Every structure is written in C-alpha cells, then in structure tokens.
Design a protein around this ligand. Sequence first.
Ligand code: 25A
Ligand code: 25A
Ligand code: 27K
Ligand code: 27K
Lengths: 680, 672
Amino acid sequence: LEEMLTQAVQEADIEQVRQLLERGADANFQEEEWGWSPLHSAVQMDSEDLVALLLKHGADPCLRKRNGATPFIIAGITGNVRLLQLLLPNVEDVNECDVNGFTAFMEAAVYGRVEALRFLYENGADVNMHRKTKQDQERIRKGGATALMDAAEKGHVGVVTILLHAMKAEVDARDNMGRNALVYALLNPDDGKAKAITRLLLDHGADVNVRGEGSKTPLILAVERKNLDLVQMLLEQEQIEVNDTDREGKTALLLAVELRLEEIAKLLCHRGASTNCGDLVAIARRNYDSDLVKFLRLHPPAENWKPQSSRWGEALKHLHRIWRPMIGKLKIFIDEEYKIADTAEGGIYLGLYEDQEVAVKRFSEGSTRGQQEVSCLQSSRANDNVVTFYGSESDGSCLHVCLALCEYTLQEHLANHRGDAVPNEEDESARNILSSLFKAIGELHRSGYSHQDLQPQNILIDSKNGTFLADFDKSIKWAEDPQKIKRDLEALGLLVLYVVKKGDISFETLKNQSFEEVIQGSPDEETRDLIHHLFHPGDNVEDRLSSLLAHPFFWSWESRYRTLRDVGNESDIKTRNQNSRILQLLQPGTLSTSFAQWTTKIDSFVMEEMNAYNLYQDTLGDLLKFIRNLGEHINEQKNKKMKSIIGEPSQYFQEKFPDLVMYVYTKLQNTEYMKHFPKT
Amino acid sequence: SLEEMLTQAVQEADIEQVRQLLERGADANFQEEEWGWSPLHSAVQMDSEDLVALLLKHGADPCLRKRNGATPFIIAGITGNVRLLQLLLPNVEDVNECDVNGFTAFMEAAVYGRVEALRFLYENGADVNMHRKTKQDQERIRKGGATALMDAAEKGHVGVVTILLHAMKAEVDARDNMGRNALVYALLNPDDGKAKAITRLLLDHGADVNVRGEGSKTPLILAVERKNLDLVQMLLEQEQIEVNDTDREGKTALLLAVELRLEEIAKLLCHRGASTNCGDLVAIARRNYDSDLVKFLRLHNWKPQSSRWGEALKHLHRIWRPMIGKLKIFIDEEYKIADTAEGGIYLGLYEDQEVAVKRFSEGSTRGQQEVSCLQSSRANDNVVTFYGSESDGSCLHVCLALCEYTLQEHLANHRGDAVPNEEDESARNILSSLFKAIGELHRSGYSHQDLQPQNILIDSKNGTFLADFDKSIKWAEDPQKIKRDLEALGLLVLYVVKKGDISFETLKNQSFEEVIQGSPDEETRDLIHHLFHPGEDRLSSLLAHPFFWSWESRYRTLRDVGNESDIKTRNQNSRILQLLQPSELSTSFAQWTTKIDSFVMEEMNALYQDTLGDLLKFIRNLGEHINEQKNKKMKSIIGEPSQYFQEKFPDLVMYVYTKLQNTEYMKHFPKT
Ligand SMILES: Nc1ncnc2c1ncn2[C@@H]1O[C@H](COP(=O)(O)O[C@@H]2[C@H](O)[C@@H](COP(=O)(O)O[C@@H]3[C@H](O)[C@@H](COP(=O)(O)O)O[C@H]3n3cnc4c(N)ncnc43)O[C@H]2n2cnc3c(N)ncnc32)[C@@H](O)[C@H]1O
Ligand SMILES: Nc1ncnc2c1ncn2[C@@H]1O[C@H](COP(=O)(O)O[C@@H]2[C@H](O)[C@@H](COP(=O)(O)O[C@@H]3[C@H](O)[C@@H](COP(=O)(O)O)O[C@H]3n3cnc4c(N)ncnc43)O[C@H]2n2cnc3c(N)ncnc32)[C@@H](O)[C@H]1O
Ligand SMILES: CCCCOC(=O)c1ccc(O)cc1
Ligand SMILES: CCCCOC(=O)c1ccc(O)cc1
C-alpha cells in the first residue's frame, strides 16, 4: 500500500513515480527478499529519467542488494554509457564489486557491452582483476577469473579482441583452479566464435597445456567437440603435448578413435601421438570404420574386479569385461546371459552403476508403472528393509531404475534351506524374515505408500540373510484412500503362513483360500492369533504392525519359558492366594482349555516328586507355580530322571499345553504384570 | 590353432596366407564364441574384395549369424561397398533378412550414409518402409520401430534423406512404436546446417508436426531448446501447429523462449498466439536482464519432512534457481547448515527431495573420496544415505540424507530428560549403532579417520548415522590406521556415557590412563581398554560386552550362574567352580559377607562365606525370594537388587564375564 505503491516504477509511468514520491516514498526502501531498490530496478530497466529523477531526490546509487551489487555495477550490464556517467561521480571506486567479485567492468564483458567497456577502461578499471568471492567458495578453488575469460566463454569475440590489444589484458592469467582464457573459449558451443577467440588467444601467448574440468587439455576439448580445425590450430603451436590424458587415462587420440573421427585421429598420429595406450585397431574395428582400421595397422590389461554377489558373480565379471556404451552412470547389456527375471515391461538385468553391481528394472520411458515405482522408491531411502535404490537413467526411450543386487527370492530361499531345520526345533529364521517384513511394511506405510502386491516373488534375500522389499510399480500413495492399507496387511497374513510352513504351501493356494481356512492352516496358537490380527487390523490401522512386533509369536522359546516361570514366582501364586490381584487376572470365576486337569496330562512319575512339598491342583496358578518350581530344579543332581523324561522343559510345556503362553499373554496383556513379558 | 591363424590372417589382409590355410583345411565358417564373428563376417566389415571372393569360393555361406544375428549381407550394407553386395546377393534367400534388433542391409546403408549401396538394395527389393522388429524385452518398452528414414534423419545424412522421400517411396509420417516420426529424429542432429535441410524436406512431404517424443516435447519445443531461429520459423509456417501444447512439465515453447534468453524466438511466438499466462513471463525476462523483452510484454504448496530445516526449505522450494543436474541449491547463509575445510554444507533439493550438500572443488582429493567411501556404504544402515553427485564444472556437489542434529546437539537437547543415577539405556543405543556402523565400514574396506561427535548425525527418529568421509582411506593400504577409529570410539564411549558433559577436545587431550580413570564404572573401563588394545572384526563381537547388558540382564545372568548345581552343592572340583577361582588382584567381593547390611545376612543363612561361588548362590537365592511377604523389610533395605549388588560390588559383572567368556557357561550371558 505504502512503499509497494511505487510498484509504479516498474509500470514506467513516471507521473505516478513523480507524484507518489510527491506524497512521500522512500526511494531507498529495499524489499528484503532480494534487496532491490527503485534505483536498482531503474538501471536494470534502462531509463534516462527514472534513474535521473530518483537520483534527483537523494536515492543513493551505492546501496547494495543481496547479491552485493550496486546500481553502478549493474549499469555495466545494460551497457548504457551515460547511465554510467550519471552515477560515475557518485562512486568511490570504479572497481567496486559484488559479493562474488564482479565489477562494473567485468560485467560489461560478460554481456558484450563494448561502449560501456571502454568508458570504464580509461577511468581506471582494472582489466586484469580476478574475482574475489567469499571464503566458502574459495576453499573449493573457485574465483580468480578475469574479464577476458568471460568475454571468452560467452563468445564476445568483439569484446575479446579489444582486451588483448587496446587494453593490455593478461592472456595467460589463470583462475583459482588454473584455467586460462583458452579453456573458457573451447567450452563455447558456437563453432565459429570458438575458433576466432582461440586464434586470438593463442597468438598472444595463451598456454595451450593448461587443464580444465576432467583434467582435459585444450586438445582433448577439441576432440570431444569433434572439431577438425581447432585440433589443427592447437597443434600448429609446437609446444602442445599430444599424449596427455584426462583424469580417466585417455589420450586425445584414444578419444579420437573412440568417437569414430577419422581425420581427427590421422593428424594426431602424423604429429606424434602414441600408438600404444590401448587397443586402437580393435576400437576402429567395432566402429565399422574400415578406412581407419586400414591406416592404424600400417603404424593386454590384467584385471581385478571382484563381484560381491555369489549367484550372479560370473555373469558380472563378464559384463565388466566386455565393452559397452554408457547410459549415464549405468553399464548394461540386453542379453539372456545377464537377464535376471521377466517383467511386464523390459525385464530385469544385471548392471554396473558407477562400477557397482546392480539389478536393472527396465520400463518404457512413458510408463505409469515406472513413475510410480520411482516415486515410492524415492520416499523409502530411509527404510532399511527396502531394496537400496541407486538411481535412474533413461536412454530417451526406456527408463532404467537401478537397485541393490540380491541373491534369492523368498520362495527360492525357503527351498534352498528347507532341510536345515530339524523337524522338532524352533524356526528362528521365520521370525527374522517376518519381523523384517513387519518393519519394512510399517516404514513403507509411515512414508505414505501401500505396496498393493506382496507375494514371495517381491521379497528378496541378499548375501547375508537380510530380507528386502522390492517391486513397487503397483504402489499407491495411501493418504487419498487410507483404507487401502488393509490389503498390505492381508498379504502379510498370507505371508506369515507361507513362511511358517516353510514354503510347503504355495502362495497361490493361499491366495485362493478364505481367511478362515488359512487360519485353520496355522500350526500353533501364536501363529493363528497373529494372522487373525492381520486380517482384522481395525478401522484403526494407525500403526498396528509395530505393536504386533511384541506378539508372543515373536518370543523365543527361552523367553516364553522365562515369562511362564517369572509369573509362577509371584508371591500369590506360590501361596495359592485366590483373592490376590494376579490370581484374579488368571482364574476369576468358573475350564475348556488344554491345561484344565493339567495334573492329569503330565506323566505320573514327574508329578510325584514335584509333590516333594496341599498338593498341586488343576489351577492355572498351580501350573505356573509348577513350571517355576521345576524350572529352578530340573538340573539338580537328585532330579536327573525328571530331566530325562521332560526333555527340554520349554518344548515340553508348549507341546503338552499349546494354548498356555497365549492364554497368559492374553490375561496379563495390559496390566502391571506385563513386566514379566520379554523385552521387545 | 589351425583356425586361429586363419582369422588373424584375414585381419592381416594376408591373402596368400588365407589361400594356403584354407586348402590345408580351415573351417571358413568357424565362429568365435564371444560374439559370433566369422572370417566371412570380418571380410565384409574390413572391405576387401579379395578376401571375400576367396572365402565364398570355399563354402563360407552368407547366412551365418553373429551374436546380434547379423549376416555378412547385412554387414555389407554398413561397409557400403557395392561390389561386395553383388557377390553375396545370389546367396541370400531374403534381401530383408534382419538381425535380432531388426536391422536390414538397407537399414544399415541408411545409418552409415552409403547411398550407392542404398540404391543397389532398393532395385533388388529392399523394403524402404520397414520398421524395426525386436525381441519382447525391447518390445514391452515401446522401443524400436524406427525406419530407414528416421535413422537417416537423426544421423543428419542429408544425401540419404532426399533419395528416400523422392526417388524411393519413403513415408514421411510413418511412426515407430514410441510414436515419433522422422521429424523429431531430424531435430536431434547437432549439426545446425544439416538439421535445417532435413527438416524442410520432411515438412514438405507431409510430416505431422504435432508429434511428441522423449520428454513429451513437441517438435516446436525442441526447436526452441536448440535455440535455432530458422528451425522455429519453418515449423510455424504450417498453420495447424499447436503452439500452446506443452511437455511433461507444463512448460511451453514461449515459456522456454523467455527462460533461455532469446528475444527474436519469443517475439515471433507471441505474434502467432502463444499464451501470455502459462507462467509469469515478464518476471523471467526481468531475472534474465533483457530490457528489450520487458519492453514487449507491455502489450499483454509443498511440505518438507524436516522440523529443524522446515521453514528454510519451504523458502528454497519457493525461489527460482538454476539446476545443476538434479540439484537445486542456493549458496546463502540462510541455507548454510555447517562449514567444511572447503565449500561448506548447505541445504538443497535433489529431484525435489531434501538433502544436505557437501561442496568440494571439482579436482579435490578430499571430495573424491568422500564419494568413493559413500558408494561402498549403500548397504550400511548406520551411514548417512547417499543420493548422488552433481558437478557444475568447478565444484562437486555430493548430496546426502538430511538429518536433524549432531550427536553433541542431541545430547544437549536431552540432557535434562534424565534423573541423576538412572540406567542410561540411550547411551547403549547410540553406542551400539556406532559399533555397527564402524564395523560395517571396516568390512567394506574403509576407515573413517576422524570420528568426532560433529560427524555423528541424529535424524527425525532418534537413529544415529556416521557421516563425513573426506579423510577416509581404503585401509588395505595401511591396516594399522584402523586404530585411529577404535581410539576415537573409545573416546566416544566415554563422551556418551558422560551424557555430553565432557567436551570431546578435552578427551582427545587426555592420556589413555586419564580416560580410564574418568570412566564411571567397570564395564565402561574394560570396554575402552579393548578398543585401545584389540585383536579383525572385533567391533561385532564387543557388542556382546556386558557394557551393552541392561541392569536386569546383568542381574539375570548372575542369578542363572548362581543356580548352577555345583555352585549350590559347593562341589569344588566341578567345572564351574574351577573357572571361578583364580594370579588375580584383590576384588571388592572378597569378604563380601562383611560388606552387606548386617540385618539382611542373618535371614539368608536359614553357612555363607566369602567364595565367589557362594556370592552367586546368594544372588540366586535372594533373587527368587526377595518379593515374598516374609522378606518385606529385607526388600526395603536392598531396594532394587540389580542396582544394590552392582553398587556394592562394582567389579562383579566384569569378573564373572571374564571367567566364563570362552566356556560352556557362556550360555548364561544374555542373548546378543
Ligand atoms: N527489480 C527487482 N525487484 C524485485 N526482485 C527482483 C528484481 N530484479 C530481479 N529480482 C529477483 O532477484 C533474484 C536474483 O537477483 P540478482 O540478479 O540481483 O542476483 C543474481 C543471483 O541472485 C546472485 C547470485 O547468483 P548465483 O547463486 O547463481 O551465483 C553466481 C555464480 O554461482 C557465481 C559465478 O562466478 P564463478 O564461480 O563462475 O567464478 O557467482 C554468481 N554469478 C555468476 N554470474 C554472475 C553474474 N553475471 N552476475 C552476478 N553474479 C553472477 O547473483 C545474480 N546473478 C546470478 N547470475 C547472474 C548473471 N549471469 N548475470 C547477472 N546476475 C546474476 C531474481 O531471481 C529476481 O526474482
Ligand atoms: N571382426 C570382429 N571379430 C571379432 N570380434 C569383433 C569383430 N568386430 C567387432 N568385434 C567385437 O563385437 C563386439 C560386438 O560388436 P557387434 O557389431 O557384433 O554387435 C553390436 C552389439 O553388440 C549388438 C547389440 O548392441 P546394443 O545392445 O548397443 O543395441 C543397439 C540398439 O539399442 C538396438 C536397437 O536400436 P534402435 O532400433 O532403438 O535404433 O540395436 C543396437 N544397435 C544400434 N545401432 C545398430 C545398428 N546400426 N546395427 C545393428 N544394431 C544396432 O549389436 C551390434 N551393434 C550395436 N550397434 C551397432 C551399430 N551402430 N552398428 C553395427 N553393429 C552394432 C564388439 O564389441 C567387438 O569387441
Ligand atoms: C532372485 C535374485 C533376484 C535379483 O533381483 C534383484 O536383485 C532385484 C532387485 C530389485 C527388484 O525390484 C527385483 C529384483
Ligand atoms: C545437525 C544436522 C546436520 C545435518 O547435516 C547433515 O545432514 C549432514 C550430512 C552429511 C554430512 O557430511 C554433514 C552433515
């Protein structure tokens, strides 16, 4: 309303800029997003009188914006030379600069403003001055460039010629990296202008063995340019070092052959390039360049690269060996030897991404499934049980998403390890796989995605038994539809049974069972109870996966036995105090379980020495008291024939009483006696 | 050895030696099994009339395929020599035979600009209008499908384009499986002159100019992005071009015309009805310093996930800046998070994701191996996640996961959450994460070389991460420097147990004996001792040290040992009792019976003396009975039993652990 009123200095309606400071407006007010003044914005705009009128009323031409720039320094851009006259007698130093080191003179140069450049020249502008930025852009070797180097790279060949001859400029000045004006010139895409500037620079003495980005020489920048005349112009100078290399060990001539440039290559041999830094007749061969193989005849490397994968090892050693073009950071070969699996689109192949072994999922460049795989992958880099995502690269027609390379599918993994477990033993491996999937899906959901198609083909296991989620091309952002989360939790129900039964029941058999059949298929009570909570997670999913990680399904056998004994040691169970708080949680009001008359179901010998004191009753309390008492003494020397008949006590009590830990868990679940549960 | 010198003789163009070793029996159809090359293949590729004619005479058939499936006939389209093409034509069933990717002889005459071969194949039935038919793993990706014309277009072969459309039936507006016609192919040739000519021929034959391609670009949008005034003019001469069509990003031809600072392209796109409201365009000429374009336009929500850096990133998303590859960054103190030796650390947006950006000089040795180490750590869950690098030619930007706090800040922010002699569970969680992270780094072949609380990061969910790998080394080259990491870790163990109260530089200035005396407990001293005196993947095994045992777990282990039969029956020749009896210095629990509260000991004797065996039996017995009502005034004087026995006998857990460490009685340690 107030100072925003002289938005009118932008409308260039000067009667509204005249009048509305007539009522009072701070011509030096600076909007502080970027610090522009009316007097700044007038010179960028180039107006005789919008400038003169603000000058007319005390607006100072040296106030700086965020960039650090003056109305003088930006007046070097517009190139208007008595806009510079109207504010020349108001400038302390004609070589004032902005925060990045730019003087009025240096910016007449980058914008080709020739009349501006000579007016500032004979009023004391330093043509040779290097740019002085802040120290955080100096400890990375920026700054130090001259006016000459930006007249160079921007192609102002008119502005360049005047600097070397009329203005004394320093041709072989370097910037803080070491580049001279020369390398700036050969980064200009304009072929004509790049040719003219470099001939002007060279004949005044630019060092032609400087280096630039990539450690390339000027000659290597000419070759990668595919430009015949710069290669010959540069070699016309007889101190050129032909066999110099970039950071990657390639000489100019090696690239000359690689990129199928016959005559470019022919002159660098004719001028002393090395015929021995690589296999150069092999490269011209595979480039179908008959005339260049022909001439290269008339005038090896041992190999370490270890793949980390064992299954894919020998296929990836081979792909390291063969020559392939790069698709970005990615080396790939569509061939059946490197094929991992078939997709609806493109399949998945092996790969080398920045020399790391990867799996490559190939999508068509437009495909919706691809864009949906990538976004979800991008929200999951913090999810430790999602396959690591290295990055995408597209060849303009086909998108390659590159992922951490794994060894086996969950289904393959369960097959290869079906025989490692004694029939009569604890399945720790099932708990590990399934707990990783709970976390993986839990984190996926907190990140706002639902997978929508989990099944053992999408679950990956790597060289060290980690399990990973993969294949997110059917995923959805679930915020717009929060009840769709429930399909991930039914699939998890199916997978809990899939893994507990060790792969014996195919996943597709399960996908055709009703919920109630799969529950009956559960082998034990912990498992049936867990699956139930995955099929009925509530209109209240929230984060039901995290709490289930505390289910007794995930308790070891030692932990289960420990909890049963620790409850059994509470004071009121040993004294059989039925009005206690613990006994009223476990057995209030009067059956129907596997441990009613539990005294009946343990063998009569073991029952008799436990009555080395009335006696034990058909109480759940007394059965926990029992477990505690035998727990503390099963190993003592008087009781070796007890120990022999019980077997391992944890297994004994669980298989004789299948529902017991689930019952105790259920009764103590949200009570102080939770403290006896194992740590989660 | 017989067929191997036939091959190098055919590459040596030694035709008298190829004569000799063919009559001596060399299989002229032998194929090397890496790529499927035959002598007759190498003969056509090499362009030699005489090697070819000689092999043909000896049964070498032009139907053998290499790995790609290409025959010497198809390779003869590449060589372009038209008298090798005569000598193998009457030996091929089908002049449009193709390799696995769909390439015919005609089609390779087009990509290699071989006009004389191109018209020889045309007058023997070569199909000019054929699209490329590949295999299903290049087929379900809508790849392929290009014509001879689309290839001659992209390659700028101005001679071959004229003959296909005029002399040879070519179809100007044929599409490939992606939908591109020859037009978009033409406007990818970098040569401005040749791209200009191909475009005028395609246009005059009826090429549809409302194709879209790669990037959802229209031909007009690639004419602007090429910055070719004369190419934009040819396309607009046709009056059904859809000017106000846009690419995948909603950016229009004129929007791009203003952004990339070219006046005359913009002036001619307004005069033909481009939309002056597809963006705010006079602000764009404003920001690009063109006064002549401001003159002419006179005539006409995103949520960050970070909390500390939230409002700074809302601002950086708002403002305009150029991209360095995938990286949006602005160097200003408002976005500075921390300072490095070189370049500092800033916020950034990488493919519109939050990152911290470490800036190095493009040549720097340190920047280079922050990255080398970062790439070997993608599997390491406790190293900061690494997104990728981007260079602007002067300065390498490595972009990493953004975290909330340094360890030192995190210990400050939670310093008051703690009761004074609380069990410090959080110290165990931080430090075990650090053990896992440094353990994983070492297995990957790197040593950090400068661990310090400023390099340890804490994210929105109390996870800890290692960062700053610019002093790191591959440790093969000097395996004795890993010791620098394990000492830093010893220092960090004390630093975290002291809750941040002792500064890291103070610890770096203490000697080893001062750091040991500064440790508050026996578990902590022993752990630091082993980090300073280790033996190759020791970090994983130390995670089983009682330092990482909770207080209940330590009390549990003592009770479980205390319940062993020979400890309760005091059989001194048993195995357990003989491990527990070394020799050793004096401990706080020799004469442990004296050091208890005198009331408590008397009800426990319903013959305790000062063996370690008996004190574990003591632990075991009081463990199982301390909570019965008969012992309520005993329970009041001990308090919590784990704390009592640890505080009366500070060395007990460590002593038992040492005695049982590599024995069967390991079974009583908590599961780690
Ligand atoms: N009247 C106005 N009112 C209100 N707002 C306005 C007004 N006018 C413009 N705006 C808004 O301000 C925003 C930025 O304002 P600004 O132009 O003053 O500052 C730019 C940038 O912020 C600020 C820092 O930009 P950066 O982060 O990219 O940093 C730049 C680069 O990283 C480094 C290059 O040097 P080196 O390492 O190569 O040696 O220095 C900067 N730089 C490069 N060329 C420069 C140049 N000719 N002149 C000045 N600085 C240059 O400098 C301005 N700028 C950037 N490139 C420029 C270039 N080629 N030519 C002229 N100025 C340039 C604009 O976006 C716009 O929204
Ligand atoms: N005399 C010899 N003796 C022994 N070994 C030899 C000999 N000569 C060369 N070698 C070694 O053979 C190895 C593979 O070279 P090759 O020519 O046999 O097989 C190539 C590649 O492997 C194999 C697959 O390569 P690619 O996966 O990159 O797949 C390429 C592309 O993505 C796909 C479809 O392209 P498009 O339809 O989307 O346009 O086909 C390939 N292709 C592209 N241009 C082609 C063209 N003109 N003609 C035929 N195929 C072309 O096909 C050969 N090839 C590729 N590009 C070629 C091209 N422009 N011109 C000619 N042949 C090409 C070489 O590396 C070399 O080591
Ligand atoms: C059975 C071995 C499969 C290897 O496949 C992969 O590594 C892989 C990675 C990510 C995917 O989305 C699919 C497969
Ligand atoms: C206190 C929060 C710091 C956030 O900094 C980072 O995320 C970061 C990441 C990698 C580094 O090397 C430095 C900082």
